Amino acid sequence: IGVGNLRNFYTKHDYIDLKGLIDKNLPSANQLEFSTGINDLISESNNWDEISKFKGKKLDIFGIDYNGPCKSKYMYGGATLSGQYLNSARKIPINLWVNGKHKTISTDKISTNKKLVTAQEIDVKLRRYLQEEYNIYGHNSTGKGKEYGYKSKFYSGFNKGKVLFHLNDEKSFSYDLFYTGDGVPVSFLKIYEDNKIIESEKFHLDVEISYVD
Amino acid sequence: GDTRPRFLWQLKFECHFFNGTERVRLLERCIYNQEESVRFDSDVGEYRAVTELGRPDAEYWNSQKDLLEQRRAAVDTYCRHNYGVGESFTVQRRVEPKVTVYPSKTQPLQHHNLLVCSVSGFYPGSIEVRWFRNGQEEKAGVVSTGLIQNGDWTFQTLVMLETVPRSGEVYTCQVEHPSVTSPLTVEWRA
Amino acid sequence: EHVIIQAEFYLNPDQSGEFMFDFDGDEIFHVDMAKKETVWRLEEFGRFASFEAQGALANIAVDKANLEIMTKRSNYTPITNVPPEVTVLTNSPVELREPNVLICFIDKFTPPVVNVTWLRNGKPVTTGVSETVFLPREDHLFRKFHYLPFLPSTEDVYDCRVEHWGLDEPLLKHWEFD
């Protein structure tokens, strides 16, 4: 079930992308909550040092609701302080190795006008791009990636891969691109609960995707 | 013999770093027979002919918009990338100097003795080597090799002091280098 | 503060090319064009990093074709030979029968073609010898280092013999432990 839920939650469902939401300043040290109209959204985290600074404030949110349709909206992390923007969106510079063959990517499809952006936002965008172009998780909506085959559990040409966030002046970190957890979004999306924020101008991505027989 | 004329083409992609990766400049250069003909400089943002011979290339490459986009992103994906990849064993490479003092095998200056402080095997190249006589620095009568690169990721330097050795005197060579918290000292007694 | 240079060249009619990375004057790595492999300057470098050798070979192919373009565009203007400056030194002070290494440093020359021979007492010596590739300089001439491990003795006399087209005769550079 991890395969269909990884594909669906990352690439089929619309991500959350809202600017200028005001956290409600509630007692919880593991949750932020904002009005989104008639309903409210809750961002769960495990990082009080980070999150205490966002309590009560105007935040921009971006990521994936782990509950999915028909349930209440909950997500992991995804928050940044509103009001700090670049003059235009920054295309994130990317090295990508496909089965070991390198190329450079620069696309508006993976970009941000946020001075400070979440690793989640970038990683979601990366993943939606890679699915569209390389059919990474199987059954994409574009028909591209024909040439990689369908041998993986995903019905695609790939079952291995990582995104490294190569930061200029902090310690670098990587996410596994094909990690499913115990199978449900509330498990594999948990990697995002730290609400990791990076300076959008001060990094690049080194991305690898491949197939292990 | 083979005295046929030679024709040489050199390429250099240079990443210049200032304050770590804080400020980076990429300079891509084409060099024909030791003369640079065309370059991309990231502070300009396009190709420019350096000589008339490279003018066709600047014009051609400047019309390829995907190419210029790649070169502009290259300060991150290439320069800052390779910096990071090699950082641990290049930027942060630390090798401690081996310090010795010896009187010269020549003493051609009558009763003026020559004392050599040899500082070898170290990395990086930033080093300070000071001579002391009785705890007081000697600036005069000092002659140096300057920094010598061995080509194997180590440097050496030799600092020679001329002095008249009087009995009781303590001569000290003192080395400060990034590989050590506190100065390295070698003592020589007259 | 730091400079990393990826430096390649192609040379005709010798049909020889090289691909290397330089960090602050020292070689990180080069590609062996014959073996199609990455050769680290210090072996331990290879434990922490990798480079795909085939990318060097692809770049060299383009360099070769471009050299031919420039040879014609210049109306067959050839290079002016610039002779090397040669220096023999050791890597550390020399002590009687304590292993050391003789360095023959060849500098400020172009084109990048040399024949280097170490001689001990007139006779050629190959035991344990090694050398760098052609290293860049900011004036676009080349540097190269050759190495001979040796056991210091009072009776031996060494020469580094360097041949380059810019030179009027082979350069013999003497070294002895006295």
Binding site: - | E28, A74, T77 | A49, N59, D63, N66
Partner: peptide, 13 residues
């Protein structure tokens, strides 16, 4: 961790 080269480009013809 992988070193990245810049591609050499074909000259104008």
């Amino acid at each position: 961790p992988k070193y990245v080269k810049q591609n050499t480009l074909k000259l104008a013809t």
